[PDB]
Design a protein around this ligand. Structure first.
Ligand SMILES: CC(=O)N[C@@H]1[C@@H](O)[C@H](O[C@@H]2O[C@H](CO[C@H]3O[C@H](CO)[C@@H](O)[C@H](O)[C@@H]3O[C@@H]3O[C@H](CO)[C@@H](O[C@@H]4O[C@H](CO)[C@H](O)[C@H](O)[C@H]4O)[C@H](O)[C@H]3NC(C)=O)[C@@H](O)[C@H](O[C@H]3O[C@H](CO)[C@@H](O)[C@H](O)[C@@H]3O[C@@H]3O[C@H](CO)[C@@H](O[C@@H]4O[C@H](CO)[C@H](O)[C@H](O)[C@H]4O)[C@H](O)[C@H]3NC(C)=O)[C@@H]2O)[C@@H](CO)O[C@@H]1O
Ligand SMILES: CC(=O)N[C@@H]1[C@@H](O)[C@H](O[C@@H]2O[C@H](CO[C@H]3O[C@H](CO)[C@@H](O)[C@H](O)[C@@H]3O[C@@H]3O[C@H](CO)[C@@H](O[C@@H]4O[C@H](CO)[C@H](O)[C@H](O)[C@H]4O)[C@H](O)[C@H]3NC(C)=O)[C@@H](O)[C@H](O[C@H]3O[C@H](CO)[C@@H](O)[C@H](O)[C@@H]3O[C@@H]3O[C@H](CO)[C@@H](O[C@@H]4O[C@H](CO)[C@H](O)[C@H](O)[C@H]4O)[C@H](O)[C@H]3NC(C)=O)[C@@H]2O)[C@@H](CO)O[C@H]1O
Lengths: 134, 134
């Protein structure tokens, strides 16, 4: 269905999760899901080039016990299809910080109040090239 | 056994898996398992500092339907407690090539004849700092 699925991550607050991968030449959208498990996501990171009505927009949302939360759309879109990008993610009690390329970075509330991230999955027109723990 | 567990890898012949991590100060052993799943491992890579009657010896083996194969032991042991070590693994239908530090490398047969690897697992006194797909 999608890409890489990693579990047992022991991502404690402060630590950084760096993910590098190449986006398809004709990418429609790609995603990175972080959380406790697939149904309890503290972060559903979804850049949309041309999908679900959104064009060149990063849509973020959470999932709690299977129920999707309120979406949060971002304006800056530093991803050119057919290139290699790197996203860096860290969190704390209050919220997570997503560092995108070109110096852009935004925050997303930690609606789940997760003290550790043990799950991550990738999907869409994206191919993981590296996963780093810092 | 077990720690970071990654599924849906879809690693194919020619592509190499690279893992970097730091070994524990009083590490008795650590392991990396590659296979089609938890019970069918084309490679159980296990560097033992002091475990199972072995002192500083790399024990490799396979597992088919849960049955451990015939152990193959290695001479070199470029591991030191506290230090960060990197290993790279490539494969084809014949055998996997474990490339260790300074140009040293050894081969282990692809006993199960897997064409692709979808499961990776890590365990023991090892801290994964990065996993790259090349
Ligand atoms: C003809 C003859 O006698 N030949 C002997 C061999 O018998 C002997 O074989 C090895 O023996 C060791 C030690 O076993 C001891 O404990 C037994 C009971 O627990 C006992 O019955 C044994 O006799 C032996 O006892 C020792 O006996 C000696 C002499 O009697 C005592 O010493 C004497 O003591 C005196 C004072 O009392 C005095 O000091 C004398 O000077 C002194 O000599 C000693 O004190 C006494 N100790 C004890 C506790 O009783 C075995 O460990 C070893 O077995 C392993 O290897 C063989 C194959 O070589 C396997 O068949 C066996 O299953 C073991 O394999 C390991 O299996 C595990 C489990 O699967 C593997 O780990 C897993 O691996 C997976 C990956 O594949 C995965 O990683 C997983 O996570 C792991 O858990 C290991 O990798 C396996 N390792 C290997 C290599 O296969 C031998 O049987 C030898 C050497 O001792 O000498 C002669 O050749
Ligand atoms: C300028 C611009 O870029 N604006 C965009 C908006 O376009 C965009 O809105 C989206 O619009 C979609 C299309 O609607 C049209 O098509 C249907 C189907 O035929 C029509 O029935 C409907 O009437 C619309 O028709 C259009 O009408 C206009 C006006 O008549 C036509 O234009 C006119 O045309 C004439 C000539 O005839 C002339 O040229 C005029 O000048 C011109 O104006 C136009 O041509 C015509 N189009 C067609 C084809 O006929 C909607 O489908 C889309 O819907 C989403 O948003 C609404 C609320 O806004 C929701 O109610 C709806 O359910 C849906 O929500 C999305 O739900 C999905 C899941 O179901 C969400 O995705 C999930 O998200 C999760 C994370 O939270 C996970 O990631 C999961 O995997 C993922 O699947 C998704 O996020 C939801 N989207 C939103 C926004 O919440 C939408 O409204 C908006 C919003 O994207 O952005 C603007 O920038």
């Amino acid at each position: 269905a999608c890409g890489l699925v990693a579990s047992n991550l022991n991502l404690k607050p402060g630590e950084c999760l760096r993910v590098r991968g190449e986006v398809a030449a004709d990418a429609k959208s790609f995603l990175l899901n972080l959380g406790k498990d697939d149904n309890n996501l503290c972060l559903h990171f979804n850049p949309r080039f041309n999908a679900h009505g959104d064009v060149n927009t990063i849509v973020c949302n959470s999932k709690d016990a299977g129920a999707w939360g309120a979406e949060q759309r971002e304006s800056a879109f530093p991803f050119q299809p057919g290139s290699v990008v790197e996203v860096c993610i860290s969190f704390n009690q209050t919220d997570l910080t997503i560092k995108l390329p070109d110096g852009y970075e935004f925050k997303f509330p930690n609606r789940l109040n997760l003290e550790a991230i043990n799950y991550l999955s990738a999907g869409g027109d994206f191919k993981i090239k590296c996963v780093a723990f810092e």
